[PDB]
Design a binder for this molecule. Structure first.
Ligand SMILES: CSc1ccccc1CC(=O)N1CCC[C@H]2C(=O)NC[C@H]21
Ligand SMILES: [Zn+2]
Length: 140
């Protein structure tokens, strides 16, 4: 589990969104595994606006933050899981690292801010849904 809290937005994995998220929906995209809902309180996270390929992510199944090198956002075939059939996720970045399903939501960050959230994994790879192209998270 986990979310990004920027401005009056809450960014979560679409597959982990709650009824309150869906009842206060701003935007969702199943191909990216992302959903954004509105919040009453303002958040403290800042979104990175960059092309970094190195950063640090939180792994809840290890209670640890790990430094990683990750790929540029791309269209990756991802194997079937409990929440999705086997399909080609978009805007996904891969790194070598440990993950189990409940680590979805952990933040990946660089020197500029939040880069994305854990979305997939398997065989020692972890997959992050990028948010750096969602410029509208910075306003309104
Ligand atoms: C961070 S999500 C994760 C991490 C480690 C293991 C599994 C998951 C998610 C998950 O349920 N599956 C099904 C089993 C095969 C895996 C794969 O290659 N793609 C999806 C993935
Ligand atoms: Zn950066």
């Amino acid at each position: 589990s986990g979310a990004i809290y920027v401005g009056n937005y809450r960014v979560v994995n679409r597959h982990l969104a709650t009824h309150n998220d869906w009842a206060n929906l701003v935007w969702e995209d199943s191909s990216r595994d992302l959903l954004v809902s509105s919040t009453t309180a303002q958040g403290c996270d800042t979104i990175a606006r960059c092309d970094c390929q190195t950063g640090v992510y939180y792994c809840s199944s290890r209670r640890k933050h790990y430094p990683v090198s990750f790929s540029k956002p791309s269209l990756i075939f991802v194997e079937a899981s409990e929440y999705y059939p086997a399909r080609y996720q978009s805007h996904l970045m891969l790194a070598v690292g440990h993950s189990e399903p409940g680590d979805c939501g952990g933040i990946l960050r660089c020197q500029h801010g939040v880069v994305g959230i854990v979305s997939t994994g398997g065989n020692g790879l972890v997959g992050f849904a990028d948010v750096r192209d969602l410029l509208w998270l910075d306003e309104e």
